[PDB]
RNA sequence: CGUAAAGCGCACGCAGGCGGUUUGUUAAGUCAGAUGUGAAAUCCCCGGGCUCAACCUGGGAACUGCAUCUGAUACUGGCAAGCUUGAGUCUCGUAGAGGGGGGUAGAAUUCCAGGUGUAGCGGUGAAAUGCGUAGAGAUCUGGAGGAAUACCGGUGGCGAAGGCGGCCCCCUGGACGAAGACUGACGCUCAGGUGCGAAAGCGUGGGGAGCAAACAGGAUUAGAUACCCUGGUAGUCCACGCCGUAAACGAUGUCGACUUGGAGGUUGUGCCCUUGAGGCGUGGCUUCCGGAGCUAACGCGUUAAGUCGACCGCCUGGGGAGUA
RNA sequence: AGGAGGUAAAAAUGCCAAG
């Protein structure tokens, strides 16, 4: 009954990239707009924006290189039935480090590579390699 | 925009949903094509057709449809290209080494029953030599002056000639197909949205590509 | 059932005004009026198993709202259940 | 976990698990650092010694832990205040074999009585048993009964499932729609628990036309405890208890989100020229075909067996055995 | 196109074969 909105966000990106949709709209949230900024600064999406005041609408324009998606895989690792937290030294490297893992640290959400050089770990959200 | 008449869209409500980029739904339950979306499409194809012609390529003119066969013959014959207009033999590109054996029988019989032995034998099988020739001259008519594989294909209907299209991209040969609102554009390398089943439409299409290839010999 | 003027009597007793019709005090009272009304229906027929499933849906929905109300405002909860005679 | 073993028959629900959105706070989870500890030996690393090796040994790392302290505050939890999309209430309508009660209608079967009327009827692959001169069957009139609802009737409708068809009334449940108003996360799932649950069966009391286990007779047959025929009790029906199972099956748990299309059925509603059966939309339910994808394949395919999330049930070779 | 039939439409019996 919509108990994970974060996995609903990655599912819309996954199904949108599979269906060759040019853009994906979803109900916005403070956490969704945070991890969408991680994908935009890392190059998986383009040009996310929030339209609305009381019921805001997160809208992401997906990315294609040739006739293929950019996110080949976007998994959700800490689902609400099983939360996963990692220390600094066992933060995962996804697809040998050429695909990022969004980790929620106490200094905001960032990639795993950003969290290692910042020196702290946290709840890992998704493997968006 | 219309440089001509009937090329605007056709074939019914029912449609391939992969061609939603080139559609307006008209009021007679007949989809009509975005003509300013296809006008840059085929002049892009004419840009590449004149390049393949400029490196002295061989261009196939495939399309049967029982109503453009007579026109696609005169298309590749006004220029110096090749065509099929009757039933496209399934396999005549990927299995070309055994269709090469069949044109040689045609090129034999165009000397046997034409100038060589035509009445020098029994009269029944002499008609059989012409009976075999008349069903080879329509199936492998425009291909007897080939002897390699074509460098390109110009299809006039994609969903009616999917066998030719599937054989082309099974090799490295690019295609230039005139796809319609019911046909599939994914096999095509140079999608041209346009009417397929209209005799004034195709003579614009084959007339432009035969004009484009006859500047390729310069 | 629970005809239109009978609901009008309840919605004015328990709510802030007449258009206030969705509040927890209104809904609990409005279900209780229907539940008490159907006791005579099942003191009779008693084999109306299809209609009793609608009764148990009204019972369980009343209990969920009271359990919502006891968590939010225990003052209005104790004022409510004495006002209709509930909480066995 | 559709068909290989595997989704409870179906619901409602307590414990439990999980939980939309915004701000503040807390700092339990979480993270960082430190301190104490995590015996030595082993294991590992760099060395050293026995002529090498096994072996012995120095130093380090490790001992993934636990506790306290000091920080971090994104996420989860707590607490406080909200918000409206989730969920719910009201107003107004619509469709329906949804349920329970009580009436009543016509068609037919059987029986009963009578008129007419004459030798067969009935039955089968063919027969016979059976019925018939005590007058059947056929036909007509009159009656008594019980049970089921032709045509409508439709891969039509409704219901959680089992299921539910004449008509009429009384009582009653749910669904859906339009346009607004209201509550403000009240939600989802659910072990144990409770309720419902075809048919057969069981208990008590009725009722008994037609069918019909058992049973009997006739056939068939090598035999025929059968198929077929003629009869025929329990049962089928009613009331009230019980049983609690089914190939209870779309062999597919419930809930939510997302992801090309086509042709229909059915039931609402908006707008426009209802001008006329139209045109344009938009909801609910439903049937069929099929794309991507998935699948061992068959196939499924916006009502998924696709892509995901929450919770539950279940499976672990066949037989023995769903048995002791 | 679906519906209904039609001298007609069925239904007598008909077991077994071993490594």
Short mmCIF file of N, CA, C and O (backbone and C1' of nucleotides) in Angstrom, two decimals, chain D residues 239-290:
data_model
loop_
_atom_site.label_atom_id
_atom_site.label_comp_id
_atom_site.label_asym_id
_atom_site.label_seq_id
_atom_site.Cartn_x
_atom_site.Cartn_y
_atom_site.Cartn_z
P A D 239 -36.03 -23.63 4.78
"O5'" A D 239 -36.24 -23.83 6.33
"C5'" A D 239 -37.43 -23.35 6.94
"C4'" A D 239 -37.62 -23.96 8.29
"C3'" A D 239 -36.39 -24.01 9.16
"O3'" A D 239 -36.10 -22.77 9.75
"C1'" A D 239 -37.54 -26.06 9.29
P C D 240 -34.61 -22.18 9.70
"O5'" C D 240 -33.92 -22.85 10.95
"C5'" C D 240 -34.57 -22.84 12.20
"C4'" C D 240 -34.06 -23.93 13.09
"C3'" C D 240 -32.56 -24.12 13.09
"O3'" C D 240 -31.88 -23.15 13.84
"C1'" C D 240 -33.63 -26.22 13.00
P G D 241 -30.31 -22.96 13.60
"O5'" G D 241 -29.67 -23.94 14.66
"C5'" G D 241 -28.45 -24.59 14.37
"C4'" G D 241 -28.37 -25.92 15.05
"C3'" G D 241 -27.11 -26.71 14.78
"O3'" G D 241 -26.02 -26.27 15.55
"C1'" G D 241 -28.94 -28.11 14.46
P C D 242 -24.70 -25.78 14.79
"O5'" C D 242 -24.05 -27.12 14.27
"C5'" C D 242 -23.67 -28.11 15.20
"C4'" C D 242 -23.51 -29.47 14.57
"C3'" C D 242 -22.35 -29.65 13.64
"O3'" C D 242 -21.11 -29.76 14.32
"C1'" C D 242 -24.25 -30.75 12.79
P C D 243 -19.79 -29.09 13.71
"O5'" C D 243 -19.44 -30.01 12.47
"C5'" C D 243 -19.13 -31.38 12.65
"C4'" C D 243 -19.19 -32.10 11.34
"C3'" C D 243 -18.16 -31.67 10.32
"O3'" C D 243 -16.97 -32.40 10.47
"C1'" C D 243 -20.31 -31.86 9.32
P G D 244 -15.64 -31.70 10.97
"O5'" G D 244 -15.18 -30.84 9.73
"C5'" G D 244 -15.02 -31.43 8.46
"C4'" G D 244 -15.07 -30.39 7.37
"C3'" G D 244 -14.06 -29.26 7.49
"O3'" G D 244 -13.61 -28.91 6.19
"C1'" G D 244 -16.22 -28.38 7.34
P U D 245 -12.11 -28.43 5.97
"O5'" U D 245 -11.65 -29.29 4.73
"C5'" U D 245 -11.57 -30.69 4.84
"C4'" U D 245 -12.46 -31.39 3.86
"C3'" U D 245 -12.23 -31.11 2.39
"O3'" U D 245 -11.11 -31.82 1.88
"C1'" U D 245 -14.55 -31.25 2.87
P A D 246 -10.18 -31.23 0.72
"O5'" A D 246 -11.18 -30.92 -0.48
"C5'" A D 246 -11.59 -31.98 -1.31
"C4'" A D 246 -12.25 -31.55 -2.59
"C3'" A D 246 -11.70 -30.36 -3.33
"O3'" A D 246 -10.50 -30.67 -3.99
"C1'" A D 246 -14.07 -30.44 -3.49
P A D 247 -9.28 -29.64 -4.03
"O5'" A D 247 -9.25 -29.16 -5.53
"C5'" A D 247 -9.23 -30.10 -6.60
"C4'" A D 247 -9.77 -29.47 -7.85
"C3'" A D 247 -11.27 -29.56 -8.04
"O3'" A D 247 -11.74 -28.37 -8.64
"C1'" A D 247 -10.19 -30.46 -9.90
P A D 248 -13.01 -27.63 -8.04
"O5'" A D 248 -12.67 -27.48 -6.50
"C5'" A D 248 -11.88 -26.40 -6.04
"C4'" A D 248 -12.71 -25.40 -5.29
"C3'" A D 248 -11.95 -24.33 -4.55
"O3'" A D 248 -11.52 -23.28 -5.39
"C1'" A D 248 -13.60 -25.20 -3.16
P C D 249 -10.00 -22.81 -5.32
"O5'" C D 249 -9.57 -22.70 -6.83
"C5'" C D 249 -9.87 -21.53 -7.58
"C4'" C D 249 -9.98 -21.83 -9.04
"C3'" C D 249 -11.31 -22.42 -9.48
"O3'" C D 249 -11.58 -22.01 -10.81
"C1'" C D 249 -9.60 -23.91 -10.00
P G D 250 -12.38 -20.66 -11.11
"O5'" G D 250 -11.48 -19.97 -12.21
"C5'" G D 250 -10.52 -20.74 -12.89
"C4'" G D 250 -9.55 -19.87 -13.64
"C3'" G D 250 -8.10 -20.31 -13.60
"O3'" G D 250 -7.84 -21.22 -14.65
"C1'" G D 250 -8.33 -17.94 -13.36
P A D 251 -6.86 -22.46 -14.43
"O5'" A D 251 -6.37 -22.24 -12.95
"C5'" A D 251 -5.29 -22.97 -12.43
"C4'" A D 251 -5.55 -23.35 -11.01
"C3'" A D 251 -4.41 -23.07 -10.07
"O3'" A D 251 -4.92 -22.90 -8.76
"C1'" A D 251 -4.67 -25.40 -10.36
P U D 252 -5.36 -21.44 -8.23
"O5'" U D 252 -4.14 -20.51 -8.60
"C5'" U D 252 -3.14 -20.23 -7.63
"C4'" U D 252 -2.29 -19.05 -8.03
"C3'" U D 252 -2.95 -17.69 -7.93
"O3'" U D 252 -1.96 -16.71 -7.60
"C1'" U D 252 -2.22 -18.02 -10.11
P G D 253 -1.55 -16.38 -6.08
"O5'" G D 253 -2.84 -15.75 -5.42
"C5'" G D 253 -3.61 -16.52 -4.51
"C4'" G D 253 -3.78 -15.83 -3.19
"C3'" G D 253 -3.93 -14.33 -3.20
"O3'" G D 253 -5.23 -13.94 -3.58
"C1'" G D 253 -2.47 -14.96 -1.48
P U D 254 -5.45 -12.59 -4.41
"O5'" U D 254 -5.35 -11.46 -3.32
"C5'" U D 254 -6.31 -11.39 -2.28
"C4'" U D 254 -5.84 -10.49 -1.17
"C3'" U D 254 -5.50 -9.08 -1.57
"O3'" U D 254 -6.63 -8.25 -1.69
"C1'" U D 254 -3.76 -9.93 -0.25
P C D 255 -6.71 -7.19 -2.89
"O5'" C D 255 -5.68 -6.06 -2.45
"C5'" C D 255 -5.91 -5.31 -1.28
"C4'" C D 255 -4.75 -4.40 -0.99
"C3'" C D 255 -4.27 -3.54 -2.14
"O3'" C D 255 -5.08 -2.42 -2.39
"C1'" C D 255 -2.42 -4.49 -1.05
P G D 256 -5.21 -1.87 -3.88
"O5'" G D 256 -3.83 -1.12 -4.12
"C5'" G D 256 -3.51 0.02 -3.35
"C4'" G D 256 -2.08 0.44 -3.51
"C3'" G D 256 -1.59 0.71 -4.91
"O3'" G D 256 -2.05 1.93 -5.43
"C1'" G D 256 0.05 -0.49 -3.73
P A D 257 -2.33 2.06 -7.00
"O5'" A D 257 -0.92 2.43 -7.59
"C5'" A D 257 -0.18 3.50 -7.04
"C4'" A D 257 1.27 3.41 -7.42
"C3'" A D 257 1.56 3.29 -8.89
"O3'" A D 257 1.45 4.52 -9.57
"C1'" A D 257 2.89 1.76 -7.71
P C D 258 0.82 4.56 -11.04
"O5'" C D 258 2.02 4.11 -11.97
"C5'" C D 258 3.24 4.82 -11.94
"C4'" C D 258 4.36 4.01 -12.52
"C3'" C D 258 4.16 3.58 -13.95
"O3'" C D 258 4.48 4.61 -14.87
"C1'" C D 258 4.89 1.75 -12.68
P U D 259 3.68 4.71 -16.25
"O5'" U D 259 4.23 3.50 -17.10
"C5'" U D 259 5.57 3.49 -17.53
"C4'" U D 259 5.89 2.20 -18.23
"C3'" U D 259 4.96 1.84 -19.36
"O3'" U D 259 5.23 2.53 -20.55
"C1'" U D 259 5.30 -0.04 -17.99
P U D 260 4.02 2.96 -21.49
"O5'" U D 260 3.48 1.57 -22.04
"C5'" U D 260 2.43 1.51 -22.98
"C4'" U D 260 2.97 1.52 -24.37
"C3'" U D 260 1.98 1.81 -25.47
"O3'" U D 260 1.63 3.18 -25.55
"C1'" U D 260 3.38 0.04 -26.13
P G D 261 0.10 3.56 -25.80
"O5'" G D 261 -0.30 2.65 -27.03
"C5'" G D 261 -1.52 1.93 -27.05
"C4'" G D 261 -1.55 0.95 -28.20
"C3'" G D 261 -2.92 0.55 -28.69
"O3'" G D 261 -3.51 1.51 -29.55
"C1'" G D 261 -1.61 -1.37 -28.41
P G D 262 -5.09 1.74 -29.51
"O5'" G D 262 -5.70 0.41 -30.11
"C5'" G D 262 -5.49 0.11 -31.48
"C4'" G D 262 -6.02 -1.25 -31.85
"C3'" G D 262 -7.48 -1.50 -31.55
"O3'" G D 262 -8.36 -0.88 -32.46
"C1'" G D 262 -6.22 -3.37 -30.90
P A D 263 -9.73 -0.26 -31.92
"O5'" A D 263 -10.75 -1.47 -31.96
"C5'" A D 263 -10.84 -2.29 -33.11
"C4'" A D 263 -11.45 -3.63 -32.79
"C3'" A D 263 -12.75 -3.60 -32.03
"O3'" A D 263 -13.86 -3.31 -32.86
"C1'" A D 263 -11.34 -5.20 -31.08
P G D 264 -14.97 -2.27 -32.37
"O5'" G D 264 -16.00 -3.16 -31.56
"C5'" G D 264 -15.94 -3.22 -30.14
"C4'" G D 264 -16.29 -4.60 -29.65
"C3'" G D 264 -17.36 -4.66 -28.58
"O3'" G D 264 -18.66 -4.58 -29.10
"C1'" G D 264 -15.53 -5.97 -27.90
P G D 265 -19.78 -3.76 -28.30
"O5'" G D 265 -20.00 -4.62 -26.98
"C5'" G D 265 -20.64 -5.88 -27.05
"C4'" G D 265 -20.65 -6.55 -25.71
"C3'" G D 265 -21.40 -5.83 -24.62
"O3'" G D 265 -22.80 -6.02 -24.68
"C1'" G D 265 -19.31 -6.51 -23.80
P U D 266 -23.78 -4.78 -24.44
"O5'" U D 266 -23.64 -4.48 -22.89
"C5'" U D 266 -24.01 -5.46 -21.93
"C4'" U D 266 -23.45 -5.13 -20.58
"C3'" U D 266 -23.89 -3.80 -20.01
"O3'" U D 266 -25.18 -3.84 -19.45
"C1'" U D 266 -21.57 -4.04 -19.73
P U D 267 -26.11 -2.55 -19.61
"O5'" U D 267 -25.55 -1.56 -18.52
"C5'" U D 267 -25.62 -1.90 -17.15
"C4'" U D 267 -24.76 -1.01 -16.31
"C3'" U D 267 -25.00 0.47 -16.45
"O3'" U D 267 -26.16 0.95 -15.82
"C1'" U D 267 -22.70 0.06 -16.45
P G D 268 -26.81 2.31 -16.34
"O5'" G D 268 -26.09 3.41 -15.46
"C5'" G D 268 -25.48 4.53 -16.07
"C4'" G D 268 -24.49 5.16 -15.12
"C3'" G D 268 -24.28 6.64 -15.28
"O3'" G D 268 -25.30 7.41 -14.69
"C1'" G D 268 -22.20 5.58 -15.10
P U D 269 -26.02 8.58 -15.52
"O5'" U D 269 -24.86 9.64 -15.76
"C5'" U D 269 -24.32 10.35 -14.67
"C4'" U D 269 -23.01 10.98 -15.04
"C3'" U D 269 -23.06 12.03 -16.12
"O3'" U D 269 -23.48 13.29 -15.63
"C1'" U D 269 -21.28 10.55 -16.56
P G D 270 -24.18 14.33 -16.61
"O5'" G D 270 -22.96 15.09 -17.28
"C5'" G D 270 -22.01 15.75 -16.47
"C4'" G D 270 -20.80 16.20 -17.25
"C3'" G D 270 -21.07 17.04 -18.48
"O3'" G D 270 -21.35 18.39 -18.17
"C1'" G D 270 -19.47 15.39 -18.99
P C D 271 -22.47 19.18 -19.00
"O5'" C D 271 -21.73 19.54 -20.37
"C5'" C D 271 -20.56 20.33 -20.37
"C4'" C D 271 -19.87 20.24 -21.71
"C3'" C D 271 -20.73 20.58 -22.90
"O3'" C D 271 -20.87 21.98 -23.11
"C1'" C D 271 -19.54 18.59 -23.33
P C D 272 -22.24 22.58 -23.67
"O5'" C D 272 -22.17 22.28 -25.23
"C5'" C D 272 -21.09 22.77 -26.00
"C4'" C D 272 -21.03 22.12 -27.35
"C3'" C D 272 -22.33 22.06 -28.12
"O3'" C D 272 -22.69 23.30 -28.71
"C1'" C D 272 -21.23 19.98 -28.29
P C D 273 -24.23 23.70 -28.82
"O5'" C D 273 -24.79 22.72 -29.94
"C5'" C D 273 -26.18 22.55 -30.14
"C4'" C D 273 -26.43 21.63 -31.31
"C3'" C D 273 -25.75 20.28 -31.22
"O3'" C D 273 -26.50 19.35 -30.46
"C1'" C D 273 -25.37 21.23 -33.36
P U D 274 -25.75 18.32 -29.49
"O5'" U D 274 -26.95 17.54 -28.80
"C5'" U D 274 -26.81 16.19 -28.39
"C4'" U D 274 -28.07 15.42 -28.66
"C3'" U D 274 -28.41 15.26 -30.13
"O3'" U D 274 -27.71 14.21 -30.78
"C1'" U D 274 -30.32 16.00 -28.96
P U D 275 -27.18 14.43 -32.28
"O5'" U D 275 -28.41 15.10 -33.03
"C5'" U D 275 -28.29 16.41 -33.54
"C4'" U D 275 -29.46 17.25 -33.15
"C3'" U D 275 -30.78 16.83 -33.79
"O3'" U D 275 -31.54 15.97 -32.94
"C1'" U D 275 -30.28 19.08 -34.39
P G D 276 -33.02 15.50 -33.37
"O5'" G D 276 -33.20 14.07 -32.67
"C5'" G D 276 -32.10 13.22 -32.42
"C4'" G D 276 -32.04 12.08 -33.41
"C3'" G D 276 -30.66 11.47 -33.62
"O3'" G D 276 -30.25 10.52 -32.64
"C1'" G D 276 -31.60 11.98 -35.71
P A D 277 -28.70 10.48 -32.22
"O5'" A D 277 -28.46 9.03 -31.60
"C5'" A D 277 -29.52 8.27 -31.06
"C4'" A D 277 -29.68 6.98 -31.80
"C3'" A D 277 -28.40 6.41 -32.40
"O3'" A D 277 -27.56 5.76 -31.47
"C1'" A D 277 -30.13 6.32 -34.01
P G D 278 -25.98 5.71 -31.73
"O5'" G D 278 -25.68 6.97 -32.66
"C5'" G D 278 -24.34 7.39 -32.88
"C4'" G D 278 -24.22 8.53 -33.85
"C3'" G D 278 -22.90 9.29 -33.78
"O3'" G D 278 -21.86 8.66 -34.50
"C1'" G D 278 -24.67 10.84 -33.73
P G D 279 -20.43 8.46 -33.79
"O5'" G D 279 -19.96 9.94 -33.46
"C5'" G D 279 -19.56 10.81 -34.51
"C4'" G D 279 -19.07 12.13 -33.97
"C3'" G D 279 -18.04 12.06 -32.86
"O3'" G D 279 -16.74 11.75 -33.31
"C1'" G D 279 -19.67 13.65 -32.30
P C D 280 -15.78 10.85 -32.39
"O5'" C D 280 -15.42 11.80 -31.16
"C5'" C D 280 -14.57 12.92 -31.35
"C4'" C D 280 -14.65 13.88 -30.20
"C3'" C D 280 -14.06 13.40 -28.89
"O3'" C D 280 -12.65 13.49 -28.84
"C1'" C D 280 -16.17 14.36 -28.49
P G D 281 -11.77 12.17 -28.61
"O5'" G D 281 -11.46 12.16 -27.06
"C5'" G D 281 -12.37 11.58 -26.14
"C4'" G D 281 -12.69 12.54 -25.02
"C3'" G D 281 -12.43 12.01 -23.62
"O3'" G D 281 -11.08 12.11 -23.24
"C1'" G D 281 -14.57 13.00 -23.70
P U D 282 -10.34 10.85 -22.59
"O5'" U D 282 -11.04 10.71 -21.17
"C5'" U D 282 -10.93 11.74 -20.20
"C4'" U D 282 -11.91 11.55 -19.08
"C3'" U D 282 -11.79 10.25 -18.33
"O3'" U D 282 -10.76 10.27 -17.37
"C1'" U D 282 -14.06 10.69 -18.82
P G D 283 -10.01 8.92 -16.95
"O5'" G D 283 -10.89 8.35 -15.76
"C5'" G D 283 -11.67 7.18 -15.94
"C4'" G D 283 -12.65 7.01 -14.81
"C3'" G D 283 -12.90 5.58 -14.38
"O3'" G D 283 -11.90 5.10 -13.51
"C1'" G D 283 -14.95 6.66 -14.67
P G D 284 -11.35 3.61 -13.70
"O5'" G D 284 -12.55 2.70 -13.21
"C5'" G D 284 -12.98 2.76 -11.86
"C4'" G D 284 -14.17 1.88 -11.63
"C3'" G D 284 -14.03 0.44 -12.07
"O3'" G D 284 -13.28 -0.34 -11.16
"C1'" G D 284 -16.10 1.26 -12.79
P C D 285 -12.27 -1.45 -11.72
"O5'" C D 285 -13.23 -2.59 -12.28
"C5'" C D 285 -13.99 -3.38 -11.39
"C4'" C D 285 -15.10 -4.11 -12.11
"C3'" C D 285 -14.68 -5.19 -13.07
"O3'" C D 285 -14.28 -6.39 -12.45
"C1'" C D 285 -16.34 -3.87 -14.06
P U D 286 -13.09 -7.24 -13.09
"O5'" U D 286 -13.65 -7.70 -14.50
"C5'" U D 286 -14.65 -8.70 -14.59
"C4'" U D 286 -15.26 -8.78 -15.96
"C3'" U D 286 -14.38 -9.37 -17.04
"O3'" U D 286 -14.33 -10.78 -16.98
"C1'" U D 286 -15.46 -7.46 -17.87
P U D 287 -12.97 -11.53 -17.36
"O5'" U D 287 -13.08 -11.74 -18.93
"C5'" U D 287 -14.04 -12.63 -19.44
"C4'" U D 287 -14.17 -12.52 -20.94
"C3'" U D 287 -12.93 -12.76 -21.75
"O3'" U D 287 -12.60 -14.12 -21.87
"C1'" U D 287 -14.08 -10.90 -22.61
P C D 288 -11.07 -14.57 -22.02
"O5'" C D 288 -10.68 -14.12 -23.49
"C5'" C D 288 -11.27 -14.75 -24.62
"C4'" C D 288 -11.01 -13.98 -25.88
"C3'" C D 288 -9.56 -13.87 -26.30
"O3'" C D 288 -9.09 -15.05 -26.92
"C1'" C D 288 -10.61 -11.78 -26.53
P C D 289 -7.55 -15.46 -26.75
"O5'" C D 289 -6.78 -14.42 -27.66
"C5'" C D 289 -6.92 -14.47 -29.07
"C4'" C D 289 -6.35 -13.25 -29.75
"C3'" C D 289 -4.87 -13.00 -29.57
"O3'" C D 289 -4.06 -13.84 -30.35
"C1'" C D 289 -6.07 -10.97 -29.44
P G D 290 -2.61 -14.28 -29.82
"O5'" G D 290 -1.78 -12.92 -29.75
"C5'" G D 290 -1.16 -12.39 -30.91
"C4'" G D 290 -0.74 -10.96 -30.69
"C3'" G D 290 0.47 -10.74 -29.82
"O3'" G D 290 1.68 -10.87 -30.53
"C1'" G D 290 -1.25 -9.31 -29.12
#
